[PDB]
Design a protein around this ligand. Structure first.
Ligand SMILES: Nc1ncnc2c1ncn2[C@@H]1O[C@H](CSCC[C@H](N)C(=O)O)[C@@H](O)[C@H]1O
Length: 271
């Protein structure tokens, strides 16, 4: 796949690779990623010593933030070995008496009780045949007053787009195919009902939905600006083909968030 050394060229030091939250207009990318993590974690009412599960933990930035700021025990799951390795190393380098572990393990295999769950843009990598199963499992491992913050992309169909004044162009269709044909997220996104209806069928209440559509446009712009500024190094680490593909993905996604063709939101999920 793609080396960490490539992503290092355009991500901030948290390594967070999901929609940031520019809670103040003048935050840096790193401040906005920490703000996004805190925005989610604040909704979980974490007390020191609870155990937080991060489903799809990436390179571990949210787990690290959870330990440092919220003083919780943490378990992170990922299917990526590179994500696991960096999460493992970063968590072991935190000085904490709490338990902090990363695992190369799917949520499908995880059955331990935890106090709270967070997940940032893992849900779109799940097969649609697992949407309900995911919420059922999440419900089962939470306590009676547990909470889950699901941060997920989602898409709109033609009918909804049109009522909002938006059309899918021939270009957008080719872009979707480009996303599916390469190694990028966004080709098989859930609908909002896919999230909400399956979560409710599993027993969750949707307490709050916070849309972050334009924050993702800004996030993607920043990643693209960073990658372009490091173009020579990116080509050296991977290739010009990969570099141009990533720039197409970053700028193309940014355009479509700005246009409103897709969205991203934090769903506060209670029992
Ligand atoms: N079934 C599954 N169980 C656990 N992790 C999964 C998963 N399917 C995908 N993932 C993980 O979800 C992550 C999606 S990328 C998002 C990374 C991180 N949450 C961030 O905010 O930057 C990857 O680590 C991927 O391996």
């Amino acid at each position: 796949d793609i080396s960490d050394d490539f992503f290092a060229l355009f991500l901030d030091p948290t390594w967070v690779y999901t929609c940031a939250y520019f809670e103040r207009d003048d935050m840096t990318l790193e401040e906005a990623q920490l703000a996004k993590v805190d925005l989610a974690l604040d909704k979980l009412n974490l007390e020191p010593g609870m155990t937080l599960l991060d489903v799809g933990c990436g390179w571990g930035g949210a787990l690290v933030r959870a330990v440092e700021k919220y003083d919780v025990n943490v378990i992170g799951l990922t299917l990526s070995r590179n994500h696991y390795e960096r999460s493992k190393d970063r968590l072991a380098a935190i000085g904490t008496q709490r338990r902090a572990e990363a695992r190369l393990q799917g949520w499908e295999e995880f059955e331990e009780n935890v106090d709270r769950i967070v997940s940032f843009e893992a849900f779109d990598a799940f097969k649609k045949e697992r949407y309900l199963t995911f919420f059922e499992r999440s419900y089962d491992i939470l306590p009676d007053d547990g909470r889950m913050l699901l941060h997920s992309l989602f898409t709109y169909d033609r009918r909804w787009l049109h009522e909002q004044g938006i059309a899918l162009t021939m270009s957008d269709l080719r872009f979707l195919k480009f996303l599916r044909e390469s190694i990028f997220p966004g080709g098989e996104l859930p609908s909002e009902p896919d999230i909400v209806d399956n979560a409710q069928a599993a027993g969750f209440t949707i307490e709050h939905v916070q849309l972050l559509q334009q924050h993702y446009a800004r996030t993607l712009d920043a990643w693209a600006a960073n990658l372009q500024a490091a173009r020579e190094r990116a080509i050296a680490v991977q290739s010009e083909e990969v570099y141009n593909n990533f720039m197409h993905y970053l700028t193309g996604c940014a355009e479509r968030f700005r246009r409103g063709l897709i969205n991203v939101a934090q769903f506060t999920m209670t029992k």
